[PDB]
Amino acid sequence: MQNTTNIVHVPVHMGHTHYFDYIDSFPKLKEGPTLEENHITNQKILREQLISGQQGLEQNLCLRNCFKLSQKRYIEFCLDRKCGGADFQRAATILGYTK
Amino acid sequence: APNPYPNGIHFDRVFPTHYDPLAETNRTKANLQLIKYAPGNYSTLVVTSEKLPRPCIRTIQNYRRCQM
Amino acid sequence: YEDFVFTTPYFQPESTFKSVPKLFSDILLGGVEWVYT
Amino acid sequence: TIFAETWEASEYQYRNKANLKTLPVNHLGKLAELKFDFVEYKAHQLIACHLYERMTIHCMNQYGLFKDFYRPECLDAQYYFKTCVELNAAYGIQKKFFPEHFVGSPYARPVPQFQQLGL
Amino acid sequence: TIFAETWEASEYQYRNKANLKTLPVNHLGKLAELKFDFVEYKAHQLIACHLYERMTIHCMNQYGLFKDFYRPECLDAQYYFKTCVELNAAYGIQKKFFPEHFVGSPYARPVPQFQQLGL
Amino acid sequence: ATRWYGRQPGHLLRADTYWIPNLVSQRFAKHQPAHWDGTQNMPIFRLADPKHKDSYMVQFR
Amino acid sequence: DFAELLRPLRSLSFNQVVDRYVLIPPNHTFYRNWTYEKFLGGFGLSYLILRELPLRNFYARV
Amino acid sequence: FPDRGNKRRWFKNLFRLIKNPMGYIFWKTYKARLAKPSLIVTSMFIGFTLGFIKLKAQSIAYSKKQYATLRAGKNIEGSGQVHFGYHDQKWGMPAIPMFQLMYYELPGNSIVVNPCRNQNYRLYFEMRKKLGI
Amino acid sequence: TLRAGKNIEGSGQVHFGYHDQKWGMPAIPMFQLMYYELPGNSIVVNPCRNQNYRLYFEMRKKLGI
Amino acid sequence: TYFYGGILEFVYFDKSNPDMCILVHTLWIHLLILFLIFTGFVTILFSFYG
Ligand SMILES: CCCCCCCCCCCCCCCCCC(=O)OC[C@H](COP(=O)([O-])OCC(O)COP(=O)([O-])OC[C@@H](COC(=O)CCCCCCCCCCCCCCCCC)OC(=O)CCCCCCCCCCCCCCCCC)OC(=O)CCCCCCCCCCCCCCCCC
Ligand SMILES: CCCCCCCCCCCCCCCCCC(=O)OC[C@H](COP(=O)([O-])OCC(O)COP(=O)([O-])OC[C@@H](COC(=O)CCCCCCCCCCCCCCCCC)OC(=O)CCCCCCCCCCCCCCCCC)OC(=O)CCCCCCCCCCCCCCCCC
Ligand SMILES: CCCCCCCCCCCCCCCCCC(=O)OC[C@H](COP(=O)([O-])OCC(O)COP(=O)([O-])OC[C@@H](COC(=O)CCCCCCCCCCCCCCCCC)OC(=O)CCCCCCCCCCCCCCCCC)OC(=O)CCCCCCCCCCCCCCCCC
Ligand SMILES: CCCCCCCCCCCCCCCCCC(=O)OC[C@H](COP(=O)([O-])OCC(O)COP(=O)([O-])OC[C@@H](COC(=O)CCCCCCCCCCCCCCCCC)OC(=O)CCCCCCCCCCCCCCCCC)OC(=O)CCCCCCCCCCCCCCCCC
Ligand SMILES: CCCCCCCCCCCCCCCCCC(=O)OC[C@H](COP(=O)([O-])OCC(O)COP(=O)([O-])OC[C@@H](COC(=O)CCCCCCCCCCCCCCCCC)OC(=O)CCCCCCCCCCCCCCCCC)OC(=O)CCCCCCCCCCCCCCCCC
Ligand SMILES: CCCCCCCC/C=C/CCCCCCCC(=O)OC[C@H](COP(=O)(O)OCCN)OC(=O)CCCCCCC/C=C/CCCCCCCC
């Protein structure tokens, strides 16, 4: 079995140039926004989050940290002990984990 | 460095030596034309596991979370 | 079990006392190859 | 666990993997390198890893643990003993949950039932 | 059987076996080696092994089978045609009964069901 | 299957003048009749295997 | 021409075809490889004749 | 101008070597061979040269073994028999009398068909008498 | 490769079997203008690593440093 | 195949059938080459004509 064998699941286009073998292009490649455009787009999100998304944050952060535990029984213990007697299903709806 | 724990695995080059790690106190040096010893002069047998990719781990965390 | 489900088929405890007589099989590090010159 | 003094070496060699280590019997020659006088019974030298344990004790009684135990005959016994029980612990587990890895096991290369041959 | 003029080159390559052969498209350059005049439609040159067949007929009509057909341009067409239908018959049967041998088949490397993961 | 068929040892003649012990010992050997037993595999000579007790001096490479 | 390839068969029956071209009596006494010994052995015989060329210049015979 | 007398001198000496190599070698080495070394040195030259040629022949044979192994279905990375990994190596027989008395190379002409094959001729003698031959 | 779990028969990179070889840059200007060897000192840690220092500057201000 | 055979395996069937020709003149040339080698051995080491 050839040692330099690879199975690729996305299309690649190989350049037919003498003395070189490489991938010169990807079919249907779309050039997205520049790094500066995404930078400006992100700053608008961070600016709003800095001005209007900082009240009532301490509670939401505690809920998020409680849900990062391994077992469910430890989450309920974290909510009741740290988050001031919160409910599992009621906190999961705030964090957006409910369907 | 201590004498490596006896290991009968060896590899011959010119002729079969019939190496016995229990026949000598200190292990004789490996001559290029005589013998090559097994790897890990100072090694033990353990069990290990590869770490799955980070994105694959996040999908597993999200499944369990949505499950419970 | 403890808020976890591990799907397994029905275990047969009778397989514990399965009579398996040991058989001889020796490994020879240093043996014969397929072709020689 | 091994419930005897002797074990077949092939039973602790792999069948589908390269064999880079063996499970050798106790090195009785290291017992003659102790310069001091000691009493050792031949009934305890074959059981796995126990000889290196008794030697370590003999050396820790004659000498201590500081500036006198640090001689080649005593450190190799302590290293052998510590290494013997680690290798045997791993081989014992591997024999318990991975018996198919070793030679002599009927599951390393299972023999099919006659119903699978189509005759 | 191939029900088109074109086939993906990878779909006839082995995934778990060394690739020592390809199933190439018809060699159109061999058609320009015939010195004599002939009428050939482009709508028949891509289908597998047929171009070599038509070339053989053209050569067996212009020349015969004795002392005039034995020229390199005509014998290579007869050999390519005899060889193309032999390989394609073998690859076609291997595609029918051993689809798991080729790249692109989902059975070459089966993807497990979610119930096999234990989540 | 190919490896297995290849280990079935071939027949190697006992006559040997290249090893000096056989060059001397075989001068005193008595060739006795090998009565056919109904087979086509009678090992009336030595076997072409490195581990054979009469072929270990031969270098199989 | 395809019908000319089958000319010697139209005059025969199937039994004659088999006994003619299939069931050739076995005879393994012939030196079949003489065909190559004569051909390739000719290079040597031709050399024995060619090495006597009366070309005066040595480099011409080269 | 160059020395046009030296033109094509390499070609000319090559053809003279082909015409009579022993004579070309003899006279081109005559003044050098006037000083002959000892029997020991001359023997070492021959022994080491023929031994190098003998190992070259064995390596040619091992390549045919690797080609047969390739045709048999085993792809081969690298080359040679100097196994870098966890395998036994078999160096060539040391060309010294110690190993030349204990070992000797396998003569293929000693691998034979079992003479039991000749007992099948018994069928021929019986069929001939059955047919009245 | 050996330590990673792949035993090696033979040695070298002159593959006798069905593999691609790479012989080495011919020491002539033609190939020395098209090819150049991989300089290991050019393989670097991504500078995004330096953006984790933002955490330090924010902590120092929270603790009043 | 079902009763007395093995698995059906795909292999490439070589149409070229090599065969070393057992000839006579080849050993003649071989002797001539060794005869030159032996004569050179004699010409260099067992030549006493000068
Ligand atoms: C009374 C006086 C005389 C009057 C009569 C005058 C008329 C004389 C001529 C008529 C009588 C001829 C007798 C023989 C019958 C031949 C009939 C025939 O058709 O032959 C055509 C014959 C075959 O044609 P071909 O099919 O092309 O085969 C040649 C191919 O090269 C082959 O290539 P290939 O690759 O296909 O095959 C390789 C080939 C090997 O081929 C080669 O390697 C040779 C290649 C040539 C050298 C390469 C450079 C070529 C450069 C190209 C240009 C060459 C031009 C040469 C023109 C010469 C014109 C004749 O090996 C073989 O195939 C088999 C060879 C083994 C045969 C063994 C010999 C049997 C012959 C009988 C032996 C007894 C005869 C006496 C012995 C000789 C005298 C001591 O053509 C040749 O003869 C070629 C020349 C070979 C040299 C022969 C010279 C012999 C002269 C003898 C004269 C008589 C004795 C003189 C005594 C003097 C005192 C009186
Ligand atoms: C529109 C389409 C067009 C299509 C056609 C295109 C074709 C273009 C044609 C125009 C090109 C030619 C221009 C005219 C040149 C006039 C210059 C001149 O006055 O003569 C200088 C030159 C000077 O030689 P010199 O003064 O008599 O003495 C030489 C020295 O003494 C030195 O001799 P040395 O004894 O002392 O030994 C040293 C010697 C020999 O040293 C060696 O060891 C080299 C040996 C090379 C041959 C062997 C290679 C090894 C492999 C084979 C093994 C054979 C031996 C095996 C032995 C048996 C083994 C058991 O060194 C040499 O290489 C001598 C070569 C001559 C000097 C030229 C400068 C060469 C420097 C580059 C060297 C590398 C290239 C080597 C080329 C081969 C040269 C023979 O004489 C010539 O050779 C003239 C050659 C021109 C011939 C033209 C013939 C007609 C051409 C058209 C025919 C159709 C062609 C169709 C081709 C189709 C496409 C492929
Ligand atoms: C560098 C290191 C590595 C070296 C590796 C090995 C090198 C190659 C080894 C080759 C050895 C083969 C020996 C063959 C038999 C020779 C027996 C003999 O008595 O010799 C005299 C013998 C001449 O005796 P003759 O037959 O009575 O011819 C005199 C006539 O007056 C001739 O009449 P002429 O004067 O009018 O002709 C002009 C003259 C000068 O013109 C030339 O030769 C220059 C151009 C010749 C063409 C280039 C040659 C290419 C190679 C030939 C074709 C492939 C191989 C053929 C088979 C050859 C083996 C027999 O032609 C000749 O010298 C004789 C003809 C040359 C052969 C041409 C025909 C070849 C085809 C043979 C057909 C017959 C055989 C049947 C086929 C056999 C195969 C199954 O010489 C030869 O025939 C050729 C010898 C070639 C030797 C070349 C290299 C020798 C030196 C190697 C040094 C090794 C290193 C160690 C040295 C240590 C020093 C310190
Ligand atoms: C196509 C294949 C290509 C690959 C193979 C290529 C092979 C090429 C070889 C070609 C020939 C080599 C060049 C010879 C030039 C012509 C003859 C000559 O030398 O003129 C006479 C001239 C003096 O001799 P003289 O005038 O007759 O006086 C002597 C008295 O009459 C009486 O004697 P004395 O009382 O005055 O002193 C005692 C005696 C001392 O006794 C000896 O002669 C010492 C030799 C003992 C045997 C050595 C083993 C045989 C070597 C050949 C077999 C190779 C084995 C396989 C190699 C495997 C590894 C590759 O002195 C001598 O007789 C001569 C010794 C001077 C050294 C001879 C030249 C070196 C040995 C031959 C080189 C072999 C290379 C083969 C492979 C090369 C692959 C790259 O020698 C010189 O040129 C003086 C040069 C200074 C030599 C001393 C310092 C040398 C230090 C470098 C040593 C290199 C060793 C290489 C080892 C090879 C690998 C293990
Ligand atoms: C009634 C009293 C006795 C009369 C006896 C009759 C004598 C008749 C003499 C007949 C002469 C024959 C003339 C024709 C031959 C001439 C051509 C020739 O090659 O001579 C060398 C000739 C002369 O060389 P040189 O430089 O003048 O040195 C001359 C002497 O070597 C001197 O060199 P050095 O001055 O430097 O002295 C140092 C010496 C230092 O030596 C020592 O100090 C002590 C030696 C102790 C030997 C210990 C041996 C231990 C053995 C252990 C082996 C164990 C393994 C056994 C395996 C058993 C398996 C179970 O070391 C050597 O010279 C080494 C020489 C090698 C000798 C090998 C034979 C040894 C025993 C022979 C016994 C013969 C019976 C004599 C009884 C006398 C008793 C008192 O060399 C050449 O230049 C010609 C070309 C040679 C090319 C090499 C290939 C040649 C091989 C073919 C030769 C022809 C066919 C075979 C002939 C026999 C060859 C052995
Ligand atoms: C070459 C040596 C000549 C002198 C030798 C003297 C010693 C004699 C000792 C011989 C002992 C007998 C041993 C058995 C010999 C076997 C010969 C052999 O095997 O080949 C026979 C075989 C018979 O052919 P088949 O019909 O196929 O076989 C039938 C078998 N019943 O003979 C042949 O191969 C044909 C070629 C024979 C040699 C030809 C000689 C070549 C020389 C050619 C130059 C002659 C002049 C040519 C002129 C041509 C004019 C047109």
Tab-separated table of C-alpha atoms in Angstrom, chain C residues 1-29:
chain	number	residue	atom	x	y	z
C	1	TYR	CA	-27.439	3.050	36.918
C	2	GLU	CA	-26.452	6.353	38.581
C	3	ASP	CA	-28.291	8.540	36.075
C	4	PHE	CA	-26.557	6.667	33.255
C	5	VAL	CA	-27.722	3.946	30.860
C	6	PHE	CA	-25.306	1.341	29.474
C	7	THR	CA	-27.100	-0.892	26.977
C	8	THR	CA	-25.890	-4.492	27.166
C	9	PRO	CA	-27.499	-7.799	26.181
C	10	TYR	CA	-28.724	-10.251	28.776
C	11	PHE	CA	-25.718	-11.605	30.653
C	12	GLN	CA	-25.409	-15.378	30.966
C	13	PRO	CA	-23.777	-16.205	34.332
C	14	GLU	CA	-23.449	-19.836	33.217
C	15	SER	CA	-20.511	-18.859	30.990
C	16	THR	CA	-18.404	-18.463	34.143
C	17	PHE	CA	-17.947	-22.219	34.651
C	18	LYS	CA	-16.964	-22.952	31.048
C	19	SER	CA	-14.523	-25.865	30.810
C	20	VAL	CA	-11.612	-24.620	28.691
C	21	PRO	CA	-8.678	-27.079	28.715
C	22	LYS	CA	-5.421	-25.282	28.003
C	23	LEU	CA	-3.558	-26.282	24.851
C	24	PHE	CA	0.125	-26.186	23.990
C	25	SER	CA	1.403	-23.446	21.698
C	26	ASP	CA	4.995	-22.210	21.666
C	27	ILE	CA	6.256	-19.023	20.031
C	28	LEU	CA	9.691	-19.133	18.397
C	29	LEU	CA	11.360	-15.734	18.136
